[PDB]
Subunit: 366 residues, 4 copies
């Protein structure tokens, strides 16, 4: 059995075109997922500029169409949130509980056995790769079972999809990485797909003061909606947001916030959470920078914890169900995150709306 799927294919020239791909039947450890909605992340745009053909998409949710012989805890028709940890569960990092940095199956750490067998998905009869081992921007996906989280809820499929990246890295960086203490102060630099979810984490965690900083006013109105207490509108020409840092310091009685989160997608702002933070504060850079930047090392000075975490320290079988609860409870808002849905043929307009500043998140729906 081979199935044909329309999908978004990125080519290795900065370009993406809707194509069709051939999805084989699941192997014993794999699962064929009918995708109902695929959310879009800033990393998905970056994927075009990677130099490989890939099935784009790393935020997805849907239903289990087929299951393999070895998979035992999930069934045809089951409702499944996709994750890109693909944890092997046995390696050194997995035994520390760091399944998000798995040494053998992570798409980031190992680039694998978190990917499904390559012949499972084919583009003009040449095997191609599922981005982050899941390639959600696709009618069907053949992934391994570690990529699936079963939830049993009537939650909207667009709301579910966004947990696969934006919501998890945002919330988990706050809760799992920084381990933000209730009653503290937090600064968020970049209230976008991730940063807005940082705010929900800070809000849900009990932060008393949540300082949203962005260059776009709509983004900031979004930050107010999702929990922010104070708003600062940064000028992009301000290098390192040092001028914003003085404004934060006025909001924290001279000394700075207790916590600060980077998620601007600007490599130059890598150190800028250090500028916003009190000595002994914790500075979390969520973006991920792979370039060579210059840092005034005075910003590091004086017991400030700095971490570049991945995927909010995600343990998908454990974290995803916790996020689902807070939604049902009402403390996660993710229906309201979904500003627009797009047909896969309109992915270009979706990319444009994420970068222009007009969407909290965009979900392609099938």
């Amino acid at each position: 059995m081979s199935i044909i799927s329309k999908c978004a294919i990125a080519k290795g020239d900065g370009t993406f075109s809707i194509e069709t791909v051939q999805v084989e039947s699941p192997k014993a450890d794999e699962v064929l997922v009918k995708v109902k909605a695929a959310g879009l992340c800033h990393t998905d745009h970056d994927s075009l500029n990677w130099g490989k053909p890939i099935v784009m998409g790393h935020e997805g949710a849907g239903f289990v169409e087929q299951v393999g012989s070895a998979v035992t805890n999930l069934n045809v028709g089951d409702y499944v949130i996709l994750n890109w940890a693909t944890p092997c569960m046995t390696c050194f990092q997995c035994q520390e509980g760091n399944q998000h940095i798995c040494e053998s199956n992570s798409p980031v750490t190992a680039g694998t056995p978190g990917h499904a067998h390559l012949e499972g998905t084919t583009w003009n009869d040449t095997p191609i790769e599922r981005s982050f081992n899941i390639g959600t921007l696709s009618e069907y996906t053949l992934v391994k079972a570690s990529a699936c989280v079963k939830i049993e809820t009537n939650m909207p499929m667009p709301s579910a999809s966004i947990i696969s990246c934006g919501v998890m890295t945002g919330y988990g960086s706050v809760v799992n990485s920084a381990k933000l203490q209730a009653g503290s102060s937090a600064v968020v630099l970049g209230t976008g797909g991730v940063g807005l979810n940082v705010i929900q984490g800070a809000r849900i965690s009990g932060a008393a003061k949540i300082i949203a900083i962005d260059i776009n006013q709509e983004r900031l109105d979004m930050a107010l909606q999702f929990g922010a207490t104070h708003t600062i509108l940064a000028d992009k020409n301000d290098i390192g947001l040092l001028k914003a840092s003085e404004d934060v310091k006025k909001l924290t009685n001279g000394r700075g916030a207790d916590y600060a989160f980077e998620c601007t997608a600007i490599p130059a702002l890598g150190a800028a959470p250090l500028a916003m933070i009190r000595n002994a504060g914790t500075a979390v850079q969520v973006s991920g920078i792979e370039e060579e930047i210059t840092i005034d090392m005075r910003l590091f000075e004086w017991d400030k914890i700095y971490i570049n975490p991945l995927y909010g320290k995600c343990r998908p079988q454990v974290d995803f169900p916790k996020l689902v609860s807070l939604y049902e409870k009402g403390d996660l808002m993710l229906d309201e995150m979904i500003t627009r849905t797009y047909p896969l043929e309109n992915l270009q307009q979706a990319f444009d709306d994420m970068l222009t500043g007009k969407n909290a998140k965009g979900v392609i729906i099938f």
Copy 2:
């Protein structure tokens, strides 16, 4: 001259008059506008000597001591009973709540104002927990005063002095409750409802309220509970309530459980409500001898009996008013009734019989 409620070692209280001296150099004269009630004030009658009752209070600074730098006449203050010295072992560890020299609990004393300061008849009498808040005017050590620059209801600020701090802090400062977790509160009263608030502020996804009175249970839902359990008096060690708790937690148990029923015989009951490797926080404080089945402790369970929610008064108190100003801490709703000093007995009855979440004595 001040109207104050004096406890008598015979076990009775009587409104009565005391004369208060001007402040010494490191002391503050605080006119009390509100004196919240706490369970231990009831047990403070059952102590063996006379005192000035009260360990929850708030007011304005009528008079300031010569070396007191950070406060001024007319400032607004919430009283705290930690009165930390800032120099002993525990204080340098950061445990200002178990101050080895000034604490009314662990050194009971410096940190209590000069004894001449409050005289009844002509015998100097002690202020309860060093502050004696059930008084019209109190003289106290400066370390027992926490200034606020916002303007909030005086009954709201007074309850911060004990119930709010112990309950919130046991969640935040002691248990260090993590978001997404399941919470069980045994006894949802003045401490218990702020445990719940502490749970909801910290982000708990499930908050199970167990209580023998439905009107608190109703209060518990007002203040953030997600599930309510009406226990029965004769459920020894609350075993049957444990079983419904585990039914609500997929088996296992809760990740956190909190005891504050004031019953000595339920001191291990948190361990029954909670999963292995969970953290059980007994808050009521038991000085009695009880029998415990040590199969409840078993398998990585973290037990603790913290005091005053690990209170560092000049840090946690400003935090609590910020979350009241944000709207996450509910304290105006917790003042079910205000009472004058003379109607104090009706206030114990309303608290002890479930009719108050918290009762405050206003001046």
Copy 3:
């Protein structure tokens, strides 16, 4: 394959016997046992009402490896563990492999036991104690019971890692997270408590006060890392006089950490008497009885915890323990009082009952 094994009865007696141990299935492993340490839990196994191949402490060589166990090979060197973690359940994904809800011989009792007719006595299948049953020439265990190690060290000293060393060292290092420069008190300096002393010594405790009724145990406590000793009286209830001696050596106040490992249920709350307000009290023994506790002793920020097997994550913890031994800081050799033939197992009990032997290892 025939295995001469110690088989416990429900009555309270044992006999040496012979059993067939079948070839390994896909997820399980056949181990030729070279050394099996002993404890009072093995004596308890006679009390329990079940036929059982006894032994929960083991080290050996792999003789047979199943189709799906490609992470170790034949001839590899293997320290056995009794957590047998399933690796995917709630506690395993929290990092609590020692309290696995699906495979633990304690918390689940089962997967984590090899397939039942693997080891058969006459033709009735018999369980291996704690899913491992090490007092046997050959044992069939899941691969989870096996931790490859890659040092040429003496098998007997490898066998005491399987229990006394992991629970004692781990009660200090993982469960208490003992901070260098602190004061430690150890109540019961025996099979468990000597590796609690060893664990305080490696973590940097500045003052380690050993308390025990036997003078021989105290001397062997100094040898294993202690700095102070106090001799204790059984007539002391709650060790309250030993607690006030502890307060003299700890500036008033108490010790920053204390540890229960005496085997006495009436002593369950004693570490709390040993400890300053806001210290941490660790009850390593496990008490399945109801006792009376003076509740003032919990009062005031004292962390009280009874942990299992020292928070064991065997594939993680065991290699680290092997590394400290290689470094000289961890002492396993001097901990083995005497070696005994399986056929002289009653000797061992006998000498454990008397208190002659801190630990006994049966070597094949």
Copy 4:
């Protein structure tokens, strides 16, 4: 009562001369210390090119000569280890326990309270500062009572004096700042005054691997004496110590060490501990860098705690007695540290030997 005191004085120009200062009698919150031994830290050389006359010295110990009328817990003749925290015990940082980054009194993080009155020490009729509030390279130093920790022992004074900075920051970085856990792997970049005490702290904490790296074979020889298990000789052209970093990964199963500590006084090596570290490890640069540097941010990538701690999170009344207790037990080696004692006049040679690597620690004896 004005005492004359021989001392070392840095002049702004990088030049040091022994001079005499008139040292005034103690005010109510002050203590006058007859310094008996004063060790040399790398920071004192740097203290030369600060553009201000200064009485040098921030490692020191002695006996109390005169006590102020408010000082109640110190008496003439007491044996005092000096510290440079001088904590006020009530500001925001002190009340979180961070006495070493005191907002009111720290010489680093705030002339300041915690310095004696300016008329107390004068050079040529003009008031002068004491470096790090204590200026220990002087026969007598006037300091605040909070500079003083009384020890009730009979330790060698040279051995007690190096606690004032070198031992405290190196051990503290491991125990207090990094909270190093036993059985771990640990890499130390620079085995000098701070780095050898890093190794001691790693050894007292129970590290299973302590890998020592330096460009000087003799200082590598010292690390083994104080606790290192493996040793890597790096070259001075190894930019960022990346090949040193390959040897480390060879020693740590290819993943990297759990912990790595940077104390080379070389700014470009600020990010080097990240290169020594496994993902989710903790990297600590104790040096302290004031210049801007260039950093490839994939070195931060993936859960890596980075922290620039000050003074090993020293609470001097709490930490200094633990150090003395661990000297009694034998596990802090610090008689061995004092490779050389010098007169005040041969400070230059003490400087020269610290910088050449011929000393572990060198102490000026008065």
